DNA sequence: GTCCCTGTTCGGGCGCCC
DNA sequence: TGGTGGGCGCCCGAACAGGGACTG
């Protein structure tokens, strides 16, 4: 016996009209089972073509599992939905969560079906289940409850969420519980063991109203600083690269100067000629190398503006990333390491990289970054879902990155 | 009969009104067709005589059907369609024979007057107002509206397709193991039942359909392999396409060509080897569908190649879910590619061709990665899994590319096939500067005003050249300079550029380009033994980039 | 700002199905 | 003979969308 709360689109905007992409047999079989079940439970309803909207659906098989999770891609509906977010939330972001020894992530998606959705908004949550080899036209549903993965779902359910959490927070003050979309982030400084014991204990209170992973250790995350090569002899080539790197880096740290080095290269020299470094050049190289230590000054997180993430493939399983909102104004620079084997899958690796990076962003600023992916669109969109494990999905775009920036952030 | 199914609610778009567009002049043979159609439809409640309370109207005409005996009443709702709301189409794609499994028993059913069996929303019927012009001394004459779905309206296909799915749901739920491929009003029904139990099951399907207002005449494909379905003919163990006949016009025009490609493309789903590059190229700036043009010695050549492959007989087979899927790809020319998909060695499931040009510059490995992509997505639609690949490219060549390439690129589980032509990289840029190779500092400037330019180099060994170009661009003058350096250097060469544009194109190892300049650069690069491209920031006094810069800047 | 150059989307035509 | 609809596919040209380099 609960009342529906009205929700609207941003002015001048219409609901999503995004075509469903091809799904593998295993996924379609799972969706058809999940959906028949959600239809019984009255949580979604079948609809016709006269509803003009659409949003893609797929499915994932979390960890080693025989349990699938429906995943509706709502980031277009979310992009379009009333600023519910920056208006109807009294929510600051738990600054301490990023410091916590161990954070665990919980999938409180089920909790949302317990609330109905504004009848007038239902139209916009439509999706379409494909069949194999198009044996059938698509089967279309719209939501009746709060959709998982929708921006309005934590907002509408905020208060009810507070009620349930409230008593748990009171008895555990040093446990910080943060919520993002379908996600509950739970951090503590408990000995690994007592922490899980305590987590199982929150999940015990959570079974009381009705009706994942892995394990995060935020304070072990760290930054990948820009760094200069150290050589016992330098070639014209070695120095030409070095000046270019510094020159660009000076756009980030304005303390970097390249003049004394740039004058070891006067004339028209062969690339493999060795130039011994003059006292100044040598010292100036030492200045810069330290300047790079210093933290980037003057960088302030603005929630109104969107988070940009860039990723460069460094090869041999290395990946480097930066998070900025304004050019050269990085909030965080990192690298992601992975298996150096022979059977490396770049695309798997890229999507594990975006999930890690997204995860850090949520934990640190409680927001999702817009990624610039160094992959071809079609390639990326062919496989990324075979590797996804998050319940959210970040915005993205694909880019042809200059072989320059890849070296700017390179490691040693 | 009319289906007792609930209607689908249908609006005009806000602010708009219904069509007021008067009939046009209709043939005598078709008015005879149209009234005979209408008076029976109206007996059956499918349409209703309207009166002058109905402001609206929309033109009508009549074409024949497949057999060419029956007539089809179309309505040109071009205006109403613009005025009608949007739909989401539910037909996501086109079923394919190669995705069918072997069944013991097969039936193909068609529904009679399909559209005219589904009710149209009551509130919307008044916009479908049309008028039959009758013989001109015996009435103005007759005016009708639709109570069922019209043929020419933008919403009919999707409302039919959705209404059918609704209607079949109970049967499908009751018969989870009879497979019904559903295409518009087309039904293919397969079972693992024996002929006579299948028959009984088919009649149940028909009673079920008929309870919902859908009739099935014959037109019932029975103990009748080969079945005619979707433009194919299916036999128990093999499928093939109904005959394809390419035109033979001697003067070819755009429109003639565009339909030569069409049938060829269509053809390529099971005739291996088809190519249409040259032909498609004919069709460039030709601003008119009528424009004729001679088939280039190259094109007229190509046309004759396919034209030969269609002469040989060919079938596909059906899909065994317990064997693997295998895509084999082979290389042609001009970024043209063919593939075949099978589970057993010489038994095609189907085939196809990839041949897009993605990008102004590229190479075989990329184009191969893209055909892989295409085929993968296609397999997921048809069989819902990914095939294993047999590719004409060495594991080594792959690893080199993926180690050099700064993008994330990947190919599914695959295996090499000695079938030439093999896919190769035609050259490899050095990682380190080359000892004992002359060092070229190149640069070009262009005067954005005049369009005049200079490309040129200066070398550590004292040589320097400057070339004035006319009608150029910075990026061009800068590519030109690299081209000068390659031209005048030995088999090994270091080149230092300040242009990211150029470095970016060349780094990525193109072997084809839309740009002749880049093509020439490519010929040069492949001829060389070692090349090392280094970059430096411009206008920083670095030498001897400073030297070339002063030199090509006489503008 | 202006050029460039490259990528994308969209529409149009043709094929095929109904 | 003209003249209708929706789906997918293929090409090609349009319009954009970006980045990078320029001017003085
Ligand atoms: N050229 C077209 N323009 C617009 N719409 C078209 C067109 N060609 C097909 N259609 C749609 O397909 C449907 O065709 C169904 P079939 O062709 O099996 O015929 P029947 O009327 O259902 O009955 P029967 O089997 O008793 O003859 C009806 C439509 F309107
Ligand atoms: Mg029919
Ligand atoms: Mg230059």
GROMACS .gro file of N, CA, C and O in nm, chain B residues 168-247:
model
  320
  580UNK      N    1   0.035  -1.629  -3.101
  580UNK     CA    2   0.106  -1.756  -3.095
  580UNK      C    3   0.159  -1.791  -2.956
  580UNK      O    4   0.207  -1.903  -2.934
  581UNK      N    5   0.151  -1.697  -2.862
  581UNK     CA    6   0.216  -1.719  -2.733
  581UNK      C    7   0.157  -1.840  -2.660
  581UNK      O    8   0.230  -1.925  -2.610
  582UNK      N    9   0.024  -1.851  -2.654
  582UNK     CA   10  -0.039  -1.965  -2.586
  582UNK      C   11   0.001  -2.099  -2.646
  582UNK      O   12   0.029  -2.194  -2.574
  583UNK      N   13   0.004  -2.105  -2.779
  583UNK     CA   14   0.042  -2.228  -2.847
  583UNK      C   15   0.187  -2.260  -2.819
  583UNK      O   16   0.221  -2.375  -2.792
  584UNK      N   17   0.272  -2.158  -2.826
  584UNK     CA   18   0.415  -2.179  -2.808
  584UNK      C   19   0.442  -2.226  -2.666
  584UNK      O   20   0.528  -2.311  -2.644
  585UNK      N   21   0.367  -2.172  -2.572
  585UNK     CA   22   0.381  -2.211  -2.432
  585UNK      C   23   0.337  -2.356  -2.416
  585UNK      O   24   0.399  -2.433  -2.344
  586UNK      N   25   0.230  -2.392  -2.485
  586UNK     CA   26   0.177  -2.527  -2.477
  586UNK      C   27   0.262  -2.627  -2.554
  586UNK      O   28   0.262  -2.746  -2.524
  587UNK      N   29   0.335  -2.578  -2.652
  587UNK     CA   30   0.416  -2.663  -2.738
  587UNK      C   31   0.558  -2.609  -2.746
  587UNK      O   32   0.604  -2.568  -2.853
  588UNK      N   33   0.630  -2.611  -2.633
  588UNK     CA   34   0.765  -2.556  -2.620
  588UNK      C   35   0.863  -2.623  -2.715
  588UNK      O   36   0.972  -2.572  -2.738
  589UNK      N   37   0.826  -2.738  -2.768
  589UNK     CA   38   0.920  -2.811  -2.849
  589UNK      C   39   0.877  -2.833  -2.994
  589UNK      O   40   0.935  -2.915  -3.064
  590UNK      N   41   0.777  -2.759  -3.039
  590UNK     CA   42   0.754  -2.740  -3.181
  590UNK      C   43   0.808  -2.601  -3.215
  590UNK      O   44   0.775  -2.502  -3.150
  591UNK      N   45   0.891  -2.592  -3.318
  591UNK     CA   46   0.952  -2.465  -3.351
  591UNK      C   47   0.877  -2.396  -3.464
  591UNK      O   48   0.852  -2.456  -3.569
  592UNK      N   49   0.840  -2.270  -3.440
  592UNK     CA   50   0.764  -2.192  -3.536
  592UNK      C   51   0.838  -2.065  -3.572
  592UNK      O   52   0.839  -1.969  -3.495
  593UNK      N   53   0.901  -2.065  -3.689
  593UNK     CA   54   0.966  -1.944  -3.737
  593UNK      C   55   0.859  -1.855  -3.797
  593UNK      O   56   0.782  -1.897  -3.883
  594UNK      N   57   0.854  -1.731  -3.749
  594UNK     CA   58   0.738  -1.644  -3.770
  594UNK      C   59   0.781  -1.519  -3.847
  594UNK      O   60   0.844  -1.430  -3.792
  595UNK      N   61   0.748  -1.514  -3.976
  595UNK     CA   62   0.789  -1.399  -4.056
  595UNK      C   63   0.673  -1.333  -4.126
  595UNK      O   64   0.618  -1.386  -4.223
  596UNK      N   65   0.638  -1.214  -4.077
  596UNK     CA   66   0.509  -1.156  -4.107
  596UNK      C   67   0.405  -1.266  -4.086
  596UNK      O   68   0.398  -1.325  -3.978
  597UNK      N   69   0.325  -1.295  -4.188
  597UNK     CA   70   0.225  -1.402  -4.177
  597UNK      C   71   0.277  -1.539  -4.222
  597UNK      O   72   0.199  -1.633  -4.239
  598UNK      N   73   0.408  -1.549  -4.241
  598UNK     CA   74   0.471  -1.673  -4.286
  598UNK      C   75   0.503  -1.764  -4.167
  598UNK      O   76   0.570  -1.721  -4.073
  599UNK      N   77   0.457  -1.888  -4.172
  599UNK     CA   78   0.494  -1.983  -4.068
  599UNK      C   79   0.571  -2.106  -4.120
  599UNK      O   80   0.521  -2.183  -4.204
  600UNK      N   81   0.692  -2.124  -4.069
  600UNK     CA   82   0.763  -2.249  -4.081
  600UNK      C   83   0.750  -2.324  -3.948
  600UNK      O   84   0.782  -2.271  -3.842
  601UNK      N   85   0.702  -2.448  -3.954
  601UNK     CA   86   0.681  -2.524  -3.832
  601UNK      C   87   0.756  -2.655  -3.839
  601UNK      O   88   0.731  -2.737  -3.928
  602UNK      N   89   0.848  -2.675  -3.745
  602UNK     CA   90   0.927  -2.798  -3.740
  602UNK      C   91   0.913  -2.872  -3.608
  602UNK      O   92   0.893  -2.812  -3.502
  603UNK      N   93   0.922  -3.004  -3.614
  603UNK     CA   94   0.904  -3.086  -3.496
  603UNK      C   95   0.993  -3.209  -3.505
  603UNK      O   96   1.038  -3.247  -3.613
  604UNK      N   97   1.019  -3.270  -3.390
  604UNK     CA   98   1.088  -3.397  -3.386
  604UNK      C   99   0.988  -3.511  -3.377
  604UNK      O  100   1.019  -3.619  -3.330
  605UNK      N  101   0.866  -3.483  -3.422
  605UNK     CA  102   0.757  -3.579  -3.423
  605UNK      C  103   0.755  -3.650  -3.557
  605UNK      O  104   0.809  -3.600  -3.656
  606UNK      N  105   0.694  -3.767  -3.561
  606UNK     CA  106   0.685  -3.846  -3.683
  606UNK      C  107   0.571  -3.790  -3.765
  606UNK      O  108   0.482  -3.726  -3.711
  607UNK      N  109   0.576  -3.814  -3.895
  607UNK     CA  110   0.488  -3.748  -3.992
  607UNK      C  111   0.344  -3.731  -3.942
  607UNK      O  112   0.286  -3.623  -3.955
  608UNK      N  113   0.288  -3.836  -3.885
  608UNK     CA  114   0.146  -3.836  -3.854
  608UNK      C  115   0.112  -3.768  -3.724
  608UNK      O  116   0.005  -3.709  -3.710
  609UNK      N  117   0.203  -3.774  -3.628
  609UNK     CA  118   0.184  -3.698  -3.505
  609UNK      C  119   0.210  -3.549  -3.531
  609UNK      O  120   0.146  -3.463  -3.470
  610UNK      N  121   0.303  -3.519  -3.621
  610UNK     CA  122   0.330  -3.382  -3.662
  610UNK      C  123   0.204  -3.322  -3.724
  610UNK      O  124   0.164  -3.211  -3.689
  611UNK      N  125   0.142  -3.399  -3.813
  611UNK     CA  126   0.022  -3.353  -3.884
  611UNK      C  127  -0.085  -3.312  -3.784
  611UNK      O  128  -0.143  -3.205  -3.794
  612UNK      N  129  -0.110  -3.399  -3.688
  612UNK     CA  130  -0.208  -3.372  -3.584
  612UNK      C  131  -0.173  -3.243  -3.511
  612UNK      O  132  -0.261  -3.164  -3.475
  613UNK      N  133  -0.044  -3.222  -3.488
  613UNK     CA  134   0.002  -3.106  -3.415
  613UNK      C  135  -0.017  -2.980  -3.499
  613UNK      O  136  -0.053  -2.875  -3.446
  614UNK      N  137   0.005  -2.992  -3.630
  614UNK     CA  138  -0.017  -2.881  -3.723
  614UNK      C  139  -0.164  -2.838  -3.729
  614UNK      O  140  -0.194  -2.719  -3.736
  615UNK      N  141  -0.255  -2.935  -3.727
  615UNK     CA  142  -0.398  -2.904  -3.726
  615UNK      C  143  -0.438  -2.832  -3.599
  615UNK      O  144  -0.526  -2.747  -3.599
  616UNK      N  145  -0.374  -2.867  -3.489
  616UNK     CA  146  -0.400  -2.800  -3.364
  616UNK      C  147  -0.353  -2.656  -3.379
  616UNK      O  148  -0.422  -2.563  -3.338
  617UNK      N  149  -0.238  -2.637  -3.441
  617UNK     CA  150  -0.189  -2.502  -3.466
  617UNK      C  151  -0.292  -2.425  -3.548
  617UNK      O  152  -0.320  -2.308  -3.520
  618UNK      N  153  -0.350  -2.491  -3.647
  618UNK     CA  154  -0.447  -2.425  -3.733
  618UNK      C  155  -0.580  -2.393  -3.664
  618UNK      O  156  -0.633  -2.282  -3.679
  619UNK      N  157  -0.635  -2.487  -3.588
  619UNK     CA  158  -0.750  -2.457  -3.505
  619UNK      C  159  -0.717  -2.336  -3.417
  619UNK      O  160  -0.799  -2.245  -3.402
  620UNK      N  161  -0.597  -2.336  -3.359
  620UNK     CA  162  -0.558  -2.230  -3.266
  620UNK      C  163  -0.557  -2.096  -3.339
  620UNK      O  164  -0.614  -1.998  -3.292
  621UNK      N  165  -0.493  -2.094  -3.455
  621UNK     CA  166  -0.490  -1.975  -3.537
  621UNK      C  167  -0.633  -1.931  -3.568
  621UNK      O  168  -0.669  -1.815  -3.549
  622UNK      N  169  -0.715  -2.025  -3.616
  622UNK     CA  170  -0.850  -1.994  -3.661
  622UNK      C  171  -0.942  -1.947  -3.548
  622UNK      O  172  -1.035  -1.869  -3.571
  623UNK      N  173  -0.916  -1.994  -3.426
  623UNK     CA  174  -0.990  -1.946  -3.310
  623UNK      C  175  -0.961  -1.797  -3.292
  623UNK      O  176  -1.045  -1.720  -3.245
  624UNK      N  177  -0.840  -1.755  -3.331
  624UNK     CA  178  -0.802  -1.614  -3.325
  624UNK      C  179  -0.826  -1.536  -3.454
  624UNK      O  180  -0.778  -1.425  -3.469
  625UNK      N  181  -0.901  -1.594  -3.547
  625UNK     CA  182  -0.939  -1.521  -3.667
  625UNK      C  183  -0.845  -1.537  -3.785
  625UNK      O  184  -0.870  -1.478  -3.891
  626UNK      N  185  -0.739  -1.615  -3.770
  626UNK     CA  186  -0.645  -1.633  -3.880
  626UNK      C  187  -0.665  -1.764  -3.955
  626UNK      O  188  -0.650  -1.873  -3.898
  627UNK      N  189  -0.697  -1.753  -4.084
  627UNK     CA  190  -0.718  -1.871  -4.168
  627UNK      C  191  -0.587  -1.913  -4.231
  627UNK      O  192  -0.495  -1.832  -4.245
  628UNK      N  193  -0.580  -2.040  -4.269
  628UNK     CA  194  -0.467  -2.092  -4.344
  628UNK      C  195  -0.514  -2.181  -4.457
  628UNK      O  196  -0.536  -2.301  -4.438
  629UNK      N  197  -0.527  -2.124  -4.578
  629UNK     CA  198  -0.557  -2.193  -4.705
  629UNK      C  199  -0.441  -2.281  -4.751
  629UNK      O  200  -0.343  -2.296  -4.679
  630UNK      N  201  -0.449  -2.339  -4.871
  630UNK     CA  202  -0.333  -2.410  -4.927
  630UNK      C  203  -0.289  -2.350  -5.060
  630UNK      O  204  -0.372  -2.326  -5.147
  631UNK      N  205  -0.159  -2.323  -5.077
  631UNK     CA  206  -0.071  -2.257  -4.978
  631UNK      C  207  -0.022  -2.322  -4.850
  631UNK      O  208   0.059  -2.263  -4.777
  632UNK      N  209  -0.069  -2.442  -4.820
  632UNK     CA  210  -0.007  -2.518  -4.714
  632UNK      C  211   0.092  -2.615  -4.777
  632UNK      O  212   0.054  -2.712  -4.838
  633UNK      N  213   0.220  -2.581  -4.766
  633UNK     CA  214   0.331  -2.664  -4.810
  633UNK      C  215   0.331  -2.791  -4.722
  633UNK      O  216   0.354  -2.780  -4.602
  634UNK      N  217   0.309  -2.913  -4.774
  634UNK     CA  218   0.282  -3.032  -4.691
  634UNK      C  219   0.386  -3.143  -4.677
  634UNK      O  220   0.483  -3.129  -4.602
  635UNK      N  221   0.364  -3.256  -4.742
  635UNK     CA  222   0.467  -3.361  -4.752
  635UNK      C  223   0.534  -3.321  -4.882
  635UNK      O  224   0.527  -3.392  -4.984
  636UNK      N  225   0.594  -3.203  -4.878
  636UNK     CA  226   0.625  -3.131  -4.999
  636UNK      C  227   0.761  -3.067  -4.991
  636UNK      O  228   0.778  -2.949  -5.020
  637UNK      N  229   0.863  -3.144  -4.952
  637UNK     CA  230   0.993  -3.087  -4.985
  637UNK      C  231   1.002  -3.086  -5.137
  637UNK      O  232   0.946  -3.173  -5.203
  638UNK      N  233   1.072  -2.988  -5.195
  638UNK     CA  234   1.139  -2.881  -5.120
  638UNK      C  235   1.038  -2.775  -5.078
  638UNK      O  236   0.948  -2.740  -5.155
  639UNK      N  237   1.053  -2.722  -4.958
  639UNK     CA  238   0.966  -2.615  -4.913
  639UNK      C  239   1.009  -2.480  -4.968
  639UNK      O  240   1.127  -2.451  -4.977
  640UNK      N  241   0.912  -2.397  -5.007
  640UNK     CA  242   0.942  -2.261  -5.051
  640UNK      C  243   0.923  -2.159  -4.940
  640UNK      O  244   0.811  -2.132  -4.895
  641UNK      N  245   1.034  -2.099  -4.897
  641UNK     CA  246   1.035  -2.020  -4.776
  641UNK      C  247   1.139  -1.910  -4.783
  641UNK      O  248   1.257  -1.936  -4.800
  642UNK      N  249   1.093  -1.786  -4.770
  642UNK     CA  250   1.183  -1.672  -4.754
  642UNK      C  251   1.275  -1.650  -4.875
  642UNK      O  252   1.383  -1.590  -4.863
  643UNK      N  253   1.233  -1.698  -4.992
  643UNK     CA  254   1.315  -1.681  -5.110
  643UNK      C  255   1.412  -1.796  -5.127
  643UNK      O  256   1.500  -1.793  -5.212
  644UNK      N  257   1.396  -1.898  -5.044
  644UNK     CA  258   1.478  -2.018  -5.054
  644UNK      C  259   1.392  -2.137  -5.094
  644UNK      O  260   1.271  -2.125  -5.116
  645UNK      N  261   1.457  -2.252  -5.105
  645UNK     CA  262   1.387  -2.380  -5.112
  645UNK      C  263   1.463  -2.474  -5.023
  645UNK      O  264   1.582  -2.494  -5.042
  646UNK      N  265   1.394  -2.529  -4.924
  646UNK     CA  266   1.455  -2.612  -4.822
  646UNK      C  267   1.425  -2.759  -4.853
  646UNK      O  268   1.309  -2.796  -4.872
  647UNK      N  269   1.529  -2.841  -4.859
  647UNK     CA  270   1.515  -2.985  -4.872
  647UNK      C  271   1.548  -3.046  -4.737
  647UNK      O  272   1.586  -2.976  -4.644
  648UNK      N  273   1.531  -3.178  -4.723
  648UNK     CA  274   1.545  -3.234  -4.589
  648UNK      C  275   1.683  -3.208  -4.534
  648UNK      O  276   1.700  -3.189  -4.414
  649UNK      N  277   1.781  -3.206  -4.624
  649UNK     CA  278   1.921  -3.208  -4.584
  649UNK      C  279   2.002  -3.093  -4.639
  649UNK      O  280   2.119  -3.077  -4.607
  650UNK      N  281   1.939  -3.011  -4.723
  650UNK     CA  282   2.010  -2.900  -4.783
  650UNK      C  283   1.916  -2.787  -4.821
  650UNK      O  284   1.797  -2.807  -4.842
  651UNK      N  285   1.969  -2.666  -4.828
  651UNK     CA  286   1.889  -2.554  -4.870
  651UNK      C  287   1.959  -2.483  -4.984
  651UNK      O  288   2.081  -2.488  -4.995
  652UNK      N  289   1.882  -2.419  -5.071
  652UNK     CA  290   1.941  -2.337  -5.175
  652UNK      C  291   1.854  -2.216  -5.204
  652UNK      O  292   1.739  -2.208  -5.160
  653UNK      N  293   1.909  -2.120  -5.278
  653UNK     CA  294   1.836  -2.000  -5.312
  653UNK      C  295   1.764  -2.024  -5.442
  653UNK      O  296   1.816  -2.092  -5.530
  654UNK      N  297   1.644  -1.970  -5.452
  654UNK     CA  298   1.569  -1.975  -5.576
  654UNK      C  299   1.649  -1.897  -5.681
  654UNK      O  300   1.723  -1.805  -5.648
  655UNK      N  301   1.635  -1.934  -5.809
  655UNK     CA  302   1.730  -1.887  -5.910
  655UNK      C  303   1.753  -1.736  -5.910
  655UNK      O  304   1.661  -1.658  -5.888
  656UNK      N  305   1.878  -1.697  -5.932
  656UNK     CA  306   1.913  -1.556  -5.946
  656UNK      C  307   1.951  -1.528  -6.090
  656UNK      O  308   2.029  -1.602  -6.149
  657UNK      N  309   1.896  -1.422  -6.146
  657UNK     CA  310   1.925  -1.388  -6.284
  657UNK      C  311   1.970  -1.242  -6.294
  657UNK      O  312   1.891  -1.150  -6.273
  658UNK      N  313   2.097  -1.223  -6.326
  658UNK     CA  314   2.154  -1.089  -6.337
  658UNK      C  315   2.123  -1.035  -6.475
  658UNK      O  316   2.129  -1.108  -6.574
  659UNK      N  317   2.091  -0.905  -6.484
  659UNK     CA  318   2.060  -0.844  -6.613
  659UNK      C  319   2.171  -0.866  -6.716
  659UNK      O  320   2.280  -0.915  -6.683
   0.00000   0.00000   0.00000
